[PDB]
Design a protein around this ligand. Structure first.
Ligand SMILES: Nc1nc2ccc(Oc3ccccc3)cc2c[n+]1[C@@H](CNC(=O)C1CCCCC1)C1CCCCC1
Length: 380
């Protein structure tokens, strides 16, 4: 509803976070909202990059599960002790839940200097929870212990500059989007998986086996900044993007995200960059719809070198070895409904998306698409 509107804050490229309390009495922490993971973890010991932490010994409702958890990732990792405790979301539904909490005791390159978050809130399914799927994810405890409907939605506005947005727990707020909401099935409940059935750059079909678009998997992830495409898809998109923007040449570091591009203030030539469209498998047979983002979405604003004058941007579309990842770049143009009860994901044009007087992000349908089921990938 209304109280929840505007409850999301953050640092550009550092993640969107919500305020939560834990323990009795209530210990306040800022928690990162992550649809790309399934554990509820918080700093539970002093840390150079932490302004505060979870002090388990100060909580009367704290119960030790006497179990441990180890989460290692590409570069770095976190580790901690499991237990339960009461948990609330001050600017969310008026309810208190007993949930699992991983008390982060050790970490390597996990917390980010100046991010303002002290923990993570995984909203994905139990399948990808750590240690195993037996550790009930927090949103699963929410729905079980209360009458909060099994659904939530995200409006990431982003427009280091601080960002904002809103997480609506248990419902939909028509005031956060324009047009109609189009839904695509959640292929399988682990990540928030979907199926891309076609890709177009500047109206031109990327023309390639749709299976390539979901090579390994396609997931909607708020815990990722970029729009990550599988290698082959990436190279094809970057090529198509250069062709459309050809009127102006840019260095190879740009396309690789290794360097930024600057223009005289308020002079960015958006019109030279093309719109991008992802077609998603619909709910009705042989039916698809498309979401369309602008350069205002994939060109993310960064701070220059020393200077501040010019308007500097980094190409926020990067290569992937882990499938298509629809991160903040895709999410910031849309109001996204994570309808867990009806096993689907809704997309509508975001009332806060950044655009101009010529174009606007879009969500359209339906389109006739055959064998969209074949677009999904399966292990050998
Ligand atoms: N959503 C998402 N949560 C994750 C959550 C936790 C995690 O353990 C770590 C992460 C960094 C260091 C040590 C351990 C990895 C994740 C990976 N993901 C995405 C990548 N993002 C990130 O690592 C951010 C998340 C928030 C914190 C900074 C790191 C994946 C999802 C699958 C496709 C590939 C990208």
């Amino acid at each position: 509803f209304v109280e929840m509107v505007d409850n999301l804050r953050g640092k550009s490229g550092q993640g969107y976070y919500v305020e939560m309390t834990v323990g009795s009495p209530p210990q306040t922490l800022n928690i990162l909202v992550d649809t790309g993971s399934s554990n509820f973890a918080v700093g539970a010991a002093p840390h150079p990059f932490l302004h505060r932490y979870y002090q388990r010994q100060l909580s009367s409702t704290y119960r030790d599960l006497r179990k441990g958890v180890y989460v290692p990732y590409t570069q770095g990792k976190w580790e901690g002790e499991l237990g339960t405790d009461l948990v609330s979301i001050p600017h969310g539904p008026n309810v208190t839940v007993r949930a699992n909490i991983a008390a982060i005791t050790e970490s390597d390159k996990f917390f980010i200097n100046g991010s303002n978050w002290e923990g993570i809130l995984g909203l994905a399914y139990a399948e990808i929870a750590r240690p195993d799927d037996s550790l009930e994810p927090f949103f699963d405890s929410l729905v079980k212990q209360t009458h909060v409907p099994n659904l939530f939605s995200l409006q990431l506005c982003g427009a280091l500059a601080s960002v904002g947005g809103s997480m609506i727990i248990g419902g939909i707020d028509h005031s956060l989007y324009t047009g109609s909401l189009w839904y695509t099935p959640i292929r399988r409940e682990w990540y928030y998986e979907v199926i891309i059935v076609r890709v177009e750059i500047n109206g031109q079909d990327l023309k390639m086996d749709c299976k390539e678009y979901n090579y390994d998997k396609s997931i909607v992830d708020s815990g990722t900044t970029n729009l990550r495409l599988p290698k082959k898809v990436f190279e094809a998109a970057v090529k198509s993007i250069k062709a459309a923007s050809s009127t102006e040449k840019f260095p190879d570091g740009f396309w690789l995200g290794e360097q930024l591009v600057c223009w005289q203030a308020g002079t960015t030539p958006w019109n030279i960059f093309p719109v991008i469209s992802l077609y998603l498998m619909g709910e009705v047979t042989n039916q698809s719809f498309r979401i369309t983002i602008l350069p205002q979405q994939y060109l993310r604003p960064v701070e220059d070198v020393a200077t501040s004058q010019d308007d500097c941007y980094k190409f926020a579309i990067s290569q992937s070895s882990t499938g298509t990842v629809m991160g903040a770049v895709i999410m910031e143009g849309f109001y996204v409904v994570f309808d867990r009860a009806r096993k689907r994901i809704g997309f509508a044009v975001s009332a806060c998306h950044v655009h101009d007087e010529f174009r606007t992000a879009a969500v359209e349908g339906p389109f006739v698409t055959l064998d969209m089921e074949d677009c999904g990938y399966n292990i050998p």
